[PDB]
């Protein structure tokens, strides 16, 4: 099956990098910025195909959303456990992936502050449409990505522990639980990349005169 990508453009407003707020996470947005770093094109696990460790039958077309996930269904009835799996990288499907870093435009930086950066990720056909040093308008979705460096930051960092209310227990003997931090940074995932001119306002001549009306 061919993967399709929907690219939206001509959004009514264009946001600065510093205008990005947490209320717009998971929402369609258009930002602008100057590209500083471009990574090389890398494969991203889209449709993972797994084999169970002890039943050893192959299953395919597993949804992959950001962090790496393994299925717990195990549809064959031969075995009885869910957690143990092994990835088949040859059989699984991948998409193009690029992490391009963008910086606030020089006219948009506030009075005394330094420019702040943002890692926007391009997937599929949008990859390699941005060059080091040009001004690009990215249309996409404001996403959120796990950050570990917020451990030393002041303030109450949210955390997640397992709720145990409907679980029966006995004090037979022979008390451990899984608690994990909720610390994140805002990132962007663009479906449309257009390069507006770095100015204020292809070697062959034929392709140039074809472009002009």
């Amino acid at each position: 099956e061919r993967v399709f990508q929907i690219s939206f453009f001509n959004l009514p407003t264009v946001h600065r990098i510093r205008d990005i707020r947490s209320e717009k996470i998971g929402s369609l947005l258009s930002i602008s910025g100057t590209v500083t770093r471009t990574s090389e094109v890398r494969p991203e696990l889209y449709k993972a195909s797994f084999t169970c460790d002890m039943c050893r039958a192959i299953v395919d077309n597993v949804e992959q959303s950001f962090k790496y996930t393994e299925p717990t269904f195990c549809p064959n009835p031969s075995c009885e456990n869910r957690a143990f799996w092994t990835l088949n990288v040859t059989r699984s499907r991948f998409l193009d992936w690029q992490k391009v870093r963008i910086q606030e435009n020089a006219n948009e930086i506030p009075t005394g502050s330094m420019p702040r950066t943002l890692d926007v990720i391009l997937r599929g056909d949008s990859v390699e449409r941005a060059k080091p040093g040009d001004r690009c308008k990215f249309t996409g979705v404001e996403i959120v990505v796990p950050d570990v460096t917020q451990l030393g930051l002041p303030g109450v960092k949210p955390s997640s522990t397992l709720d145990t209310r409907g679980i029966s227990k006995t004090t037979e003997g022979l008390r451990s639980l899984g608690v994990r931090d909720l610390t994140y940074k805002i990132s962007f995932l663009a479906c449309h990349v257009i390069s507006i001119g770095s100015n204020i306002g292809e070697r062959d001549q034929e392709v140039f005169l074809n472009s002009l009306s």
Partner: protein, 96 residues
């Protein structure tokens, strides 16, 4: 006991900046300038084990270049004990 076949004059020509999702597990012909190279290392090719329970030396097994190979049976003392790779009876290929 090993003959390597080298395919020459592959027609499709790719630059390193245009390798994509479609070229995985496929033959690509790419040009470029070598920046730096590592030393020649011995990679296991015909892997031979010994069993710590009995000392028996197991048969040679081909090492796939994709992943490490491991053995779980001894076939002499019938044990799943810890087997160790001995380098004197293991055969290697060059790696760079």
């Amino acid at each position: 006991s090993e003959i390597h076949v080298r395919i020459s004059d592959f027609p499709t020509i790719y630059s390193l900046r245009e390798l994509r999702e479609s070229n995985l597990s496929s033959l690509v012909r790419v040009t470029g300038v070598v920046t730096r190279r590592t030393g020649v290392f011995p990679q296991l090719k015909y892997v031979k084990f010994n069993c710590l329970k009995c000392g028996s030396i197991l048969g040679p097994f081909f090492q796939d270049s994709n992943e490490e190979i491991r053995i779980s049976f001894c076939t002499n003392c019938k044990s799943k004990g810890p087997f160790r790779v001995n380098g004197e009876k293991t055969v290697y290929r060059n790696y760079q």
